[PDB]
Write a protein that binds this ligand. Structure first.
Ligand SMILES: CC(C)(COP(=O)(O)OP(=O)(O)OC[C@H]1O[C@@H](n2cnc3c(N)ncnc32)[C@H](O)[C@@H]1OP(=O)(O)O)[C@@H](O)C(=O)NCCC(=O)NCCNC(=O)CCC(=O)O
Ligand SMILES: CC(C)(COP(=O)(O)OP(=O)(O)OC[C@H]1O[C@@H](n2cnc3c(N)ncnc32)[C@H](O)[C@@H]1OP(=O)(O)O)[C@@H](O)C(=O)NCCC(=O)NCCNC(=O)CCC(=O)O
Ligand SMILES: CC(C)(COP(=O)(O)OP(=O)(O)OC[C@H]1O[C@@H](n2cnc3c(N)ncnc32)[C@H](O)[C@@H]1OP(=O)(O)O)[C@@H](O)C(=O)NCCC(=O)NCCNC(=O)CCC(=O)O
Ligand SMILES: N[C@@H](CCCCC(=O)O)C(=O)O
Ligand SMILES: N[C@@H](CCCCC(=O)O)C(=O)O
Ligand SMILES: N[C@@H](CCCCC(=O)O)C(=O)O
Lengths: 274, 274, 274
């Protein structure tokens, strides 16, 4: 990986001057290799280590560079045409590979090459962008989007119309991360490297970014950037000092319980069979 | 229907042990028949009877079982491939059938087999899941989603990015129902068997589930699970006891009037011609 | 343009009696010409003149008439079929034209014919409807929608799941307009001819329509229908007179600054190369 990491970090510095025509064979083959590993799950943009999520910036750099080294090509849709430079992950798969890989892909769900999809996941019509990692047993419901380099844990349920922030535009320092066993309610959005800790339940229409106050009504504590494991979060507002208006905020109303669990469970019958 | 209802309710009990390989010819043919009837409108998951919506649980059971009896197959997209077990409703249609059926399907709108689409409807790019029923003159605007088994009335307008809850995952007791002549504003969501009574207008960004308080500012009455016919609903918040924060709620601000009607009308010129 | 404007305004009056069969060759060829010009950018539905946006109603009329003069046709998807009357903009393009045109179209992004897409734009999977105009350097992120006749400025960033109001259904007087250099946050919606003035930043989950109060906490001034240039807008609520509840509103919390700019920048490396 040093043999790759090196070439990669070298080119990034020259990013604005590289183009699909002036790029040297070395750098091209390397970025190519790195994208192929992300696509495999062999490498991943962010990892939890010693109980801390860490970002491998050189891997974000390679994702970025792929856009400088590759040229667009016409892609043939059936009733229309496309012109883009990132290949479709599943375009070369056959039943054997799909069977071997063990996930379900509902038309017209789409995934870019360079994204990792784990066994036993179900992708309803949705989008998974380059460099993302989607772990085992997770469902990505209709019109949801897993942003560039985003990290989705095992057994997570991303409801309909949910958006998980990328790192490409706007440019971001760290990917967005949703830990294991979380449920993200319909039309909610999690962006800007916010971390939703495991086993948490985010309600519908909840918008979390670095400037969002996650208010714990119990303790009076206000969080920023992260949702403490096992929380149930809903939309609310906090009043101005004069009380003349109030602004949006996320409110932790309680810890997940049986009652909550009743409404957010994963349906095993929909998962992979034997 | 007893000849079908019977086999169906028998297998459901053995749901976890059935698989596409061990399933007996009988049960397979039956589930198959039942799905074909839902697809026709001949049967429907929930029906209003004596002015009460009622759920036919055995029909929800068959929808569920279809996922145990059928195996995935590679579906050929143009630029990509899919692997799933529910056929595409329109894959076998020709102009004659489309002409005869009388609705409009805008690419890349997609509908699963087992869903009923009525005459004179317009599907912008969106998703309609198995077992759903969409009645006459309704428009499903861009990126909207009609969840599994959901019931949509006649002349309804589901705006852009609207989501109507399914019953598959999370698993639900009753489907979500939107009665006739309702207008659901952009990016709103209605889930968990909530019922929106006829002629109601839901504003943009309104999220309704069983735990959502639908507050009538006029009467002071708080509803749960249903929107009284002819209401105009918008987002709001209710203050904590200490007044230190407030939480999301839906507010009935008034009864539909000419003024309202001015903003939510169906455009007949877009509907079917002669 | 008078030779077209004339025929157009004549037919519109007879809109309900025209059909794909009874329509005269003249009116057909004209509507056809007018749609071809909108598609080219040669004509546009709304234009800023003397620092005021103005709507060319006759052009909205032609868009409307196209739905009366054209008949549906089966469109062949790969795994499914469609039945509609507005052709796909890119169906006839080849690499040369795409290269010449200079924008990027990510599968399965879709655009109707009669919509203008400018050089150096990037369309992630999304929808651009007939008569819309999307200016230079703009990005339309995943699942966003540019409504019928909507006007999007240069270098604008429409985030994921964003919806920009159309004028077809419900029927609208004026198109929705987003001026140059604006950033519209994830899952927000701008409809009903509201105008977002240049260089403004709309946060996530902000819903703006004619009845939305845009409250300036600094001045105490409440706007309706427009976002003053350079504002940063977020969701909030305003309290009832009795203080027994509060209702949704948009709050201008500040003027764009370096801090803001840090979170909303366009990524030039993603744009067109040389
Ligand atoms: C978060 C919930 C699970 C509710 O938590 P719960 O049921 O365990 O707890 P409750 O006791 O009901 O609520 C605790 C407090 O929170 C408040 N609360 C809970 N949920 C709330 C909500 N959504 N809005 C406002 N307040 C809420 C309660 O009013 C209560 O108030 P208080 O404690 O002060 O008296 C629920 O609100 C929710 O968000 N469910 C998820 C909905 C969802 O996303 N469903 C997916 C849609 N299904 C589909 O198939 C869609 C398909 C598609 O769109 O494509
Ligand atoms: C609900 C409305 C129709 C407004 O109701 P109305 O116009 O009949 O009533 P009003 O008199 O304006 O409002 C009554 C009260 O409700 C409040 N109110 C109304 N609408 C409100 C809103 N959206 N937000 C907050 N308050 C609102 C008013 O401020 C007023 O306050 P009060 O009475 O206390 O003084 C409107 O707000 C609305 O939601 N319209 C629907 C918007 C929509 O979904 N459009 C579809 C978008 N069009 C497209 O083409 C999108 C395309 C795509 O996304 O793909
Ligand atoms: C508007 C912001 C940029 C924040 O403005 P800022 O960072 O310049 O200013 P701040 O100093 O943080 O905020 C000023 C005031 O507004 C409040 N505020 C700011 N943003 C807020 C928000 N989102 N919610 C609530 N309050 C907010 C602050 O709390 C602060 O309060 P006060 O001044 O009274 O003390 C941010 O909130 C925001 O909306 N960012 C855009 C998020 C977004 O849409 N990202 C796109 C997602 N990225 C992807 O890749 C998605 C992919 C996909 O979905 O497909
Ligand atoms: N907000 C998105 C934009 C992706 C752009 C991808 C492309 O240009 O191909 C993200 O950061 O992931
Ligand atoms: N929330 C959605 C999930 C559908 C899953 C369909 C599938 O697995 O094929 C619903 O209940 O309708
Ligand atoms: N709300 C949308 C509906 C578009 C309908 C287009 C069609 O019928 O083909 C708009 O006004 O743009």
């Amino acid at each position: 990986m040093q043999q790759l990491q090196n070439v990669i970090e070298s080119a990034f510095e020259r990013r604005a001057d590289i183009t699909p025509a002036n790029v040297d064979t070395v750098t091209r083959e390397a970025v190519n290799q790195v994208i192929g590993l992300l696509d495999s799950g062999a490498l991943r943009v962010a990892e939890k280590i010693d109980g801390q999520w860490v970002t491998h910036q050189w891997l974000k750099k390679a994702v970025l560079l792929s856009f400088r080294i590759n040229d667009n090509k016409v892609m043939d849709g059936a009733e229309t045409r496309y012109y883009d430079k990132v290949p479709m992950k599943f375009a070369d798969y056959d039943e054997a590979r799909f069977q071997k890989e063990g996930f379900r892909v509902v038309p017209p769900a789409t995934v870019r090459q360079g994204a990792f999809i784990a066994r036993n996941t179900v992708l309803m019509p949705s989008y998974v962008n380059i460099g993302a990692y989607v772990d085992e047993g997770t469902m990505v419901d209709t019109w949801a989007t897993v942003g560039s380099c985003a990290q989705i844990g095992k057994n997570v349920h991303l409801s309909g119309g949910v958006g998980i922030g990328g790192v490409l535009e706007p440019l971001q320092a760290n990917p967005t991360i949703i830990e294991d066993n979380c449920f993200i309610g319909a039309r909610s959005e999690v962006v800007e490297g916010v971390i939703v800790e495991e086993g948490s339940v985010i309600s519908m229409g909840v918008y979390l970014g670095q400037s969002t106050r996650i208010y714990d009504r119990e303790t009076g504590e206000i969080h920023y950037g992260r949702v403490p494991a096992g929380s149930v979060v809903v939309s609310g507002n906090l009043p101005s000092k004069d009380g003349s208006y109030s602004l949006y905020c996320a409110v932790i109303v309680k810890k997940v319980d049986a009652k909550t669990r009743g409404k957010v469970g994963i349906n095993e019958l929909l998962r992979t069979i034997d």
